[PDB]
Amino acid sequence: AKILCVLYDDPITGYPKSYARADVPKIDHYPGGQTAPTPKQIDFTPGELLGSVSGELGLRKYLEGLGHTLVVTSDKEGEDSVFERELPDAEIVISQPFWPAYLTPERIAKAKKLKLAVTAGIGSDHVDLEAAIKNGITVAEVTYSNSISVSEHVVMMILSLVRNYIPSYQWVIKGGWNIADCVERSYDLEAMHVGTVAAGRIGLAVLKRLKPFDVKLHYFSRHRLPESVENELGLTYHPSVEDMVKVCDVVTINAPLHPGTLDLFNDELISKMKRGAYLVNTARGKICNRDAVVRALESGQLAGYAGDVWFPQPAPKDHPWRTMPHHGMTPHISGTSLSAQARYAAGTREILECWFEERPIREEYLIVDGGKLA
Ligand SMILES: NC(=O)c1ccc[n+]([C@@H]2O[C@H](COP(=O)([O-])OP(=O)(O)OC[C@H]3O[C@@H](n4cnc5c(N)ncnc54)[C@H](OP(=O)(O)O)[C@@H]3O)[C@@H](O)[C@H]2O)c1
Numbered sequence: 001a002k003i004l005c006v007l008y009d010d011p012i013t014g015y016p017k018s019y020a021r022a023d024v025p026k027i028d029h030y031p032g033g034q035t036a037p038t039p040k041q042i043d044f045t046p047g048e049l050l051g052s053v054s055g056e057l058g059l060r061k062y063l064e065g066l067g068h069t070l071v072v073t074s075d076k077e078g079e080d081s082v083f084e085r086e087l088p089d090a091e092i093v094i095s096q097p098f099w100p101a102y103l104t105p106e107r108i109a110k111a112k113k114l115k116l117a118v119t120a121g122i123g124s125d126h127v128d129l130e131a132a133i134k135n136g137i138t139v140a141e142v143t144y145s146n147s148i149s150v151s152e153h154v155v156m157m158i159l160s161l162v163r164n165y166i167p168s169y170q171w172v173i174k175g176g177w178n179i180a181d182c183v184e185r186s187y188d189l190e191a192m193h194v195g196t197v198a199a200g201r202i203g204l205a206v207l208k209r210l211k212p213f214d215v216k217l218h219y220f221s222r223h224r225l226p227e228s229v230e231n232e233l234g235l236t237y238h239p240s241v242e243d244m245v246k247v248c249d250v251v252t253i254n255a256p257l258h259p260g261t262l263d264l265f266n267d268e269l270i271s272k273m274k275r276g277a278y279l280v281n282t283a284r285g286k287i288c289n290r291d292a293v294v295r296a297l298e299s300g301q302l303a304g305y306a307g308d309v310w311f312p313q314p315a316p317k318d319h320p321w322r323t324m325p326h327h328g329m330t331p332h333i334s335g336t337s338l339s340a341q342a343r344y345a346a347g348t349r350e351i352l353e354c355w356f357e358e359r360p361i362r363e364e365y366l367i368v369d370g371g372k373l374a
């Protein structure tokens with residue numbers, strides 16, 4: 001069978017010949033007890049670059065040893081792309097959210113042999129689930145594999161926005177000291193009100209990391225956390241997002257992209273935030289209306305915005321989030337740290353072994369299975 005695997009390009013300086021450190025820590029399990037991926041073998045050393053074209057997610061020796069073929073490409077856009085030309089023959093398609101091969105209804109129709117679509121990462125909004133359901137395609141993602149990685153990125157970005165890190169760094173490089181210039185927009189985070197949209201694997205990890213900063217914590221969720229958790233973390237529950245954002249100095253978005261969160265932070269909702277609020281979004285770019293965020297930063301309604309997720313991906317050269325004032329953006333990188341790559345690459349192989357050995361894929365990895373939502 002044919003496996004079609006879309007990855008981002010190598011660094012412009014070539015695939016790395018060395019790394020800054022000798023190894024990465026061993027992660028055995030996630031908070032709550034889900035075990036780390038359990039592939040039978042791996043053909044990489046954790047810490048290597050796996051999600052670029054030369055990395056191949058460590059999959060070629062395994063797949064070709066079984067007689068299957070593996071096509072790796074970064075060329076994913078349009079009908080003339082390698083991805084779309086190779087799609088009609090593929091039993092399995094793999095891509096990462098960071099450089100996503102969108103499986104639209106049209107492409108799924110053309111993918112006559114497609115039976116398994118794997119998200120190397122978390123969040124399968126690039127896959128049209130209705131068409132996958134219609135066509136009996138299994139959709140899997142590597143649940144929890146980089147949730148902690150994102151929670152780290154969130155707190156990092158919150159601190160940098162509030163404490164005005166990046167403009168202060170720039171004064172060093174420019175040859176200046178300029179203390180007053182740095183701190184005329186520098187605050188402590190301590191005792192601010194911080195709220196999260198969703199308290200899932202990322203959102204809860206964010207709340208736990210924020211707690212010892214002595215912030216006043218808020219959250220909005222469809223379902224409440226156990227009261228024992230709310231008490232230990234000092235959480236205030238809000239039954240609507242509007243209610244929460246009214247009182248928050250900082251808001252972090254940690255919910256998946258779906259109809260209920262598409263365009264949720266539009267002009268109206270952002271106008272309900274505190275003036276000078278900070279907004280962080282490492283969830284899915286489209287949960288925030290692109291031009292509304294730009295306008296709120298230009299007016300001062302938002303004091304700062306940061307995240308790693310954009311619409312579309314890759315972001316075009318003229319994307320307005322590149323140049324809006326007071327931002328601390330990165331490209332979509334938090335979920336593909338070298339540490340996270342090791343976990344989602346192991347998980348991708350685990351899923352593939354289960355697929356080819358006719359053993360069940362972990363229930364926690366499954367998004368649709370056997371023609372229905374999991
Ligand atoms: N590199 C990155 O930046 C990166 C990496 C990984 C993931 N992500 C994004 O982050 C999402 C969350 O990741 P995760 O590991 O935390 O998944 P998760 O464990 O499934 O948590 C998602 C939580 O969002 C809740 N929620 C859903 N809709 C909501 C809404 N309209 N308002 C408030 N809360 C809502 C869900 O609760 P219910 O059970 O009630 O629906 C769930 O608890 C992913 O879907 C993905 O898009 C980004």
Ligand SMILES: [Co+2]
Nearest residue numbers: 221222223224
């Ligand atoms: Co529910």
Ligand SMILES: [Co+2]
Nearest residue numbers: 255256257258
């Ligand atoms: Co959901």
